[PDB]
């Protein structure tokens, strides 16, 4: 029900940093990125069309830490909502509670944020939410409880929040350790390199 | 094709009957395996293929392939037939479920283990 394995291997099959070990240090430096996703990893794949579509879906799931039935349900919900299904799908992945806890700098990675969410260290709107996939509405206040406030992790995580780009659709404020999800993220406000038409076309075959 | 001709007599695609009269279209059936054979295949292949002939529980006497390397079937040995054609033998339409009623799992197997009735080796 979640991955639990070598993370930088997943980041190495995709060829791109999936932010799976954000943590203390800088850019990887001990990953052997691009070089060998397994034993025959030095081989160029010469990847197919199914391979590029598949590999795009796997990039997105392995970023946000979602498995397939849950992702597939996000595609059905993004499909039925009015508008653009790629952009709706990223809006559904960005409203996840573990993601919003990661974006605010409360967790160093999304797995650490998922353990903060999971171990009842996070309230939304003054109610404790235990669930990684809670869908944070706009104009909500998500914060850390009094237990697990001033624990080392979150402090260190806010320390590495300043190294990243400070997302526009949040009120990050780390003094009180509370945040406000203000609006839904625009497609132009996130990541610029994921090709969601490939995963629309992957599920539409 | 003219719409009058279809009002007089509509389109009708045929029924496309079943490859496997395991009757009622049940997932498995059980049978008694009246005998055990080895049978030579069709022309481009050559082997001796281990195949039983089975009196099912619904009356039908059908022949059935036995998967994997080596079996313990002999003539009474109540087995669970499955459904699935072996193209290389003329007229077998079924398989035996290994790891079922009187059909043991394949000895010393480690991969694709579930489809041969073999439990996980303790390690």
């Amino acid at each position: 029900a979640r991955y639990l394995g070598p993370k930088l291997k997943l980041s190495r099959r995709e060829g791109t940093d999936l932010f799976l070990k954000s943590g203390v240090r800088a850019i990887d430096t001990k990953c052997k990125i691009e070089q060998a996703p397994g034993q025959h990893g030095a081989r160029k794949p010469r990847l197919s069309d199914y391979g590029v579509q598949l590999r795009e879906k796997q990039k997105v799931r392995r970023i946000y830490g979602v498995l397939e039935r849950q992702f597939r349900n996000y595609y059905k919900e993004a499909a039925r909502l009015k508008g653009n299904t790629g952009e709706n799908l990223l809006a559904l992945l960005e409203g996840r509670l573990d993601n919003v806890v990661y974006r605010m700098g409360f967790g160093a990675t999304r797995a650490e944020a998922r353990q903060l969410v999971s171990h009842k260290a996070i309230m939304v709107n003054g109610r404790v939410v235990n669930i990684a996939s809670y869908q944070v509405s706009p104009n909500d206040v998500v914060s850390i409880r009094e237990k697990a406030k001033k624990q080392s992790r979150v402090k260190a995580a806010l320390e590495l929040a300043e190294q990243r780009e400070k997302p526009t659709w949040l009120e990050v404020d780390a003094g009180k350790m509370e945040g406000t999800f203000k609006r839904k993220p625009e497609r132009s406000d996130l990541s610029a390199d994921i090709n969601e038409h490939l995963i629309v076309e992957l599920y539409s075959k | 094709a003219t719409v009058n001709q279809l009002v007089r007599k509509p389109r009708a695609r045929k029924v496309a009957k079943s490859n496997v009269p395991a009757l009622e279209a049940c997932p498995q059936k059980r049978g008694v395996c009246t005998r055990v054979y080895t049978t030579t295949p069709k022309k481009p292949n050559s082997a001796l293929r281990k195949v039983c002939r089975v009196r099912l529980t619904n009356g039908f006497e059908v022949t059935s392939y036995i998967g994997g390397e080596g079996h313990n079937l002999q003539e009474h040995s109540v087995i669970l037939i499955r459904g699935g054609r072996v193209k290389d033998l003329p007229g077998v339409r079924y398989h035996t479920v290994r790891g079922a009623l009187d059909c043991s799992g394949v000895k010393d197997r480690k991969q694709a283990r579930s489809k041969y009735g073999v439990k996980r080796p303790k390690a």
């Binding site: - | 719409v3 009058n4 279809l6 009002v7 509509p10």
Partner: protein
């Protein structure tokens, strides 16, 4: 008013009764062609004024025999 139908006499020979064919003109559900379609009805008339080949209006009433739940109102267009 009352709901009535119009049709033509298809046969005559019965003892104070008649039988009337009705022509409903209905679109085929699959093919979209408007097709003629009949409805033969055993219709009552007191004193059997209408003969074969007529055109007659007809209303529904209580049962008067087996099938027969229909009775004429106006014989029109008898022309032979």
């Amino acid at each position: 008013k009352i709901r009535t139908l119009q049709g033509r006499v298809v046969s005559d020979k019965m003892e104070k009764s008649i039988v009337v064919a009705i022509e409903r003109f209905v679109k085929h559900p699959i093919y979209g062609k408007f097709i003629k379609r009949t409805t033969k009805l055993h219709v009552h008339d007191e004193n059997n004024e209408c003969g074969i080949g007529d055109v007659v209006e007809i209303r529904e009433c209580r049962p008067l025999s087996k099938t027969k739940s229909w009775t004429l109102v106006r014989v029109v267009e008898k022309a032979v």
